[PDB]
Amino acid sequence: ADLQDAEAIYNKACTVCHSMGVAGAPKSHNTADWEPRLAKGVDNLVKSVKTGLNAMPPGGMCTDCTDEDYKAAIEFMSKAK
Ligand code: HEC
């Protein structure tokens, strides 16, 4: 796919699960779901993404993804997760 826009990255990748909340995924736009993430910081969740959590593919479903577009994508939502 395409690594030009944080919006395009989340909207194509963090979309299957997080858009509706399928597989128990936490929402794109919550406050209480992001609170216990923003309490640590930002670049702590980018890691659990690149690593692939249990129900989550390694890379968060992106292959060639750089921390730049990665974090921009996390911060497009609510700068935690
Ligand atoms: C379904 C195939 C998913 C895709 C695609 C992405 N995510 Fe995801 N995410 C999913 C689930 C079911 C969960 C687990 C919720 C639980 O607590 O059981 C998550 C969780 C996260 C988290 C939070 C991890 C934590 O600290 O608990 C983050 C940081 C997150 N997801 C980010 C993220 C991004 C940025 C993705 C696109 C690149 C992405 N996820 C894709 C399911 C799915």
Automatic annotation (TrEMBL):
<dbReference type="GO" id="GO:0005506">
    <property type="term" value="F:iron ion binding"/>
</dbReference>
<keyword id="KW-0349">Heme</keyword>
<keyword id="KW-0249">Electron transport</keyword>
<dbReference type="GO" id="GO:0020037">
    <property type="term" value="F:heme binding"/>
</dbReference>
<keyword id="KW-0813">Transport</keyword>
<feature type="disulfide bond">
    <location>
        <begin position="62"/>
        <end position="65"/>
    </location>
</feature>
<keyword id="KW-0732">Signal</keyword>
<dbReference type="GO" id="GO:0009055">
    <property type="term" value="F:electron transfer activity"/>
</dbReference>
<feature type="domain" description="Cytochrome c">
    <location>
        <begin position="4"/>
        <end position="81"/>
    </location>
</feature>
<keyword id="KW-0408">Iron</keyword>
<protein>
    <submittedName>
        <fullName>Mono-heme c-type cytochrome ScyA</fullName>
    </submittedName>
</protein>
<keyword id="KW-0479">Metal-binding</keyword>
